Amino acid sequence: AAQTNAPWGLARISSTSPGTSTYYYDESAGQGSCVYVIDTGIEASHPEFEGRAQMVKTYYYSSRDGNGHGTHCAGTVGSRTYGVAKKTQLFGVKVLDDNGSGQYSTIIAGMDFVASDKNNRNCPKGVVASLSLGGGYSSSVNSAAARLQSSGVMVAVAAGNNNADARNYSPASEPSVCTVGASDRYDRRSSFSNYGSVLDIFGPGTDILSTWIGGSTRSISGTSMATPHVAGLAAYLMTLGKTTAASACRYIADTANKGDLSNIPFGTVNLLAYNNYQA
Template structure:
């Protein structure tokens, strides 16, 4: 059984870009029964996907009693199902239930990070009529969920909606013990309060949804728990940022063909009106090979190497070796990329009230999430597809497109000057 690793795209100034190994876990539609000997029938973590017309809690409780499954998260909004700890033979027995669509091994998630934000200047956030960057600190009427390592709940530069915090990982709090999620939140929405940094949508309400632990790891079930929570609050949350990625593909059927529960959950959440913005990945590979970047229902963002916040390629390298104003040398590419945004040497908020500079497609994605938030402020009824189209139409090709760009297509660079 393969282990699936997820990562939130990240690299510190002092560390090299982390490599990621991912594999797709098989769906356990018909698992053969094996010996009860614990050496041949080990206990593992599983995700059980039920028929949509089932009551997830009722079925989960029945399975816990009948098959001794140790039930964890129960999903009832973005996905009908539950997560459980059980043996392989117990999972096979559960899979045989007519109410069950499929059972799959749970996956593991891990962060992979890569950073005035020069990015704010590069996307012209300071000229946005909605952002109104004028040194007046006021909340913006839009809500953005950050599915990540949590968010520093009392960072002075963030408008964190603490009552909306959700912890789907270990521990008891959605507070950020890593820093990555707080960095993402700052790029989206750091306050215009004349201190620290400023985000693309200053003062937007941040919903911290902790799906990765302090080391940046988490199970698929924890990520689905976060998506499920966002979907349950889709009447309040307009945007969700997910800087997560792993090897996988889009089956064109919301995960129902290849048994991808996370894809089905995201499709349901998008149908509920939430716009998802995701990182393309840092493997210098076709994004079609990575999920959720490959999903058609999300906005997938690659990273621009930008060192001075201006076009023209005249920026001097700062925190990393790269070519100014071109696609970052670590960024994924391909037909699934919807937008490109600054992703190198981005300064933003960090855990325990601090600030730091890091790089990655994880840093590019929240620029676009902030842009989506700006658009939703003035277009509250816009669907996720309309948000994507509006951002692409507002984008610019004013960046240096290299002749050796592997995908042969120049994506629009996020620009929020008119939003």
């Protein structure tokens, strides 16, 4: 399948070259997979989600996304226009308040929630969690992410936006999950993107158009934007039967575009998420 005039990031993940604007992908499009978006919520009523998104958990007075951040990330995972996996099932878990903030204890509960809740859902092709969040190092946060991964969920987490080594951030620094850095449309490391040996992969993170609350759209930047590219890619690849929740981060690194990014610090992988789709 081909989506013309796609957001640059979608075109990038199906391309061996930057600078193109069509997104190419197998029409299965992540059908039968599930992606949990652990964030500020999802505006499920957005036309872009086509009834495939729903809130399943909140820790605040509402499950609504009063921020936009979670809706944007969800949109990059699986919205019809802005999403990688356009037929996946999206599940919202609101661990961040409408200011974009969350206590680690709440974030940990949300991860353990997903590890269990997936058993209440139909996801024959597998389960992914997208975590565009984090703060300073916490062994407790990392272990929660490790449990979620161990339970059979492909965990994708943001490297962070400090232009620093992601070893000092959580859940970014948890080795067993998939830690995602950010690149821009000219294949440069995003200026804000964390780096380090704990990174597994890069995804499009600078100037990413996706859904927003109020049934709108906007372009914003962050490793928060790169992460759902990889989460969506995982769901897509798992639906194709090419990999599993436990092996998908590795499969994505195996099949990534290699050595194409600039300003990658020595010791950080130079790998860009790629779906290797061949019509």
